[PDB]
Symmetry: D2
Subunit: 115 residues, 4 copies
């Protein structure tokens, strides 16, 4: 489990459940190719997106479908989605936890990188 | 205007208007004595809280009544209020802008010292 | 484990380890009396602060000694500390996770409340 | 000034100066076409990116080159950049202020629509 995504709801004070997450990897031609996807669980977490073998060095984009999340709650959000673009494993395999705290007109994201 | 407070609403995407703000200064006996207070304007800002002469070195506490703000919007907030406690150093010309971004169960605050 | 504190470092992308945390409860005379204290572990978490029996309704203040944390890293922080003041269990026992993301001149805190 | 960008530094407690900002608009073919660009000023702000006439309804992407900002400070950041993607509705008079608070491994962004 080298890549983990945690999504929290700042309005309800709870995990953001069933949020669609799409992960892409930048290909040689500067194109974003689908890498993995899933939905957050009851704990607002998404595990098992990839393996150490498949998660090679590269530029990755974690796209969180925040818009659909808020719409389902009857709130008109500002953002189309939240994106986190980062270079991974450039100096060896690391464990990445990408966390996002969501509000209708704002979001905060942080990363926790472990060995 | 050595001290300025800016409050934003992360739910409505607007300035947090009419939010009560109380500023205290720590006294010699470790007690918090009232220093200044006001309410944010239409731009979610609060100016003229103090002057350079009165704003001396010390420990200050900026208390933002976030609870009343959310209650007025029909939302039950988590926090009683948001507090920002800092030491106003006074080492060279400095203006302090305390900004706070509010959500019902969360708040973020930052300081811009220029 | 009705009260949990999680502290993260936004500068290093890691858990904030060994951060002193003091919890107070507002007494009848509007005074803050010591309730519990501890230091965050390697995971940036602090468990076992109290029990369901002892964690009664009331106003609590979680004080995070952020200043000492940054000083130890050779960084002069803005805040003396970070405080989170909230009413707990006013409508029955709840589980509270208080999270704080720290930066030298900024901090973000959120709460996750469970049944 | 229908669109304004404000960038702050959470590590130094100051405006994020000289940060490159690129704005794109989604074209009919789902492609991102350059719309405007600039660099934040001493106040960490970027004004005059567009006009009311040119800023029509559509999906816009504000890209903040955070990586270059941190590298210049001798800090290795986590993100390649920070992006803010939103639909500019155009329902009544509206000004958009996109604010971003930057940290090496974290960033927070909010929108103030007044
Ligand atoms: O502004 C904010 C941005 C991010 C966060 C993250 C919190 C968090 C808490 C956990 O227990 C586990 C985790 O992986 C992440 C909190 C506030």
């Amino acid at each position: 489990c080298p890549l983990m995504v945690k999504v929290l709801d700042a309005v309800r004070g709870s995990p953001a459940i069933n949020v669609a997450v799409h992960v892409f990897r930048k290909a040689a031609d500067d194109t974003w190719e689908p890498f993995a996807s899933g939905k957050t669980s009851e704990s607002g977490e998404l595990h098992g997106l990839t393996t150490e073998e498949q998660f090679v060095e590269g530029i990755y984009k974690v796209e969180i479908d925040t818009k659909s999340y808020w719409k389902a709650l009857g709130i008109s959000p500002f953002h189309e989605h939240a994106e986190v673009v980062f270079t991974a494993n450039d100096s060896g395999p690391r464990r990445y936890t990408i966390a996002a705290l969501l509000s209708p007109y704002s979001y905060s994201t942080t990363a926790v990188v472990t060995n």
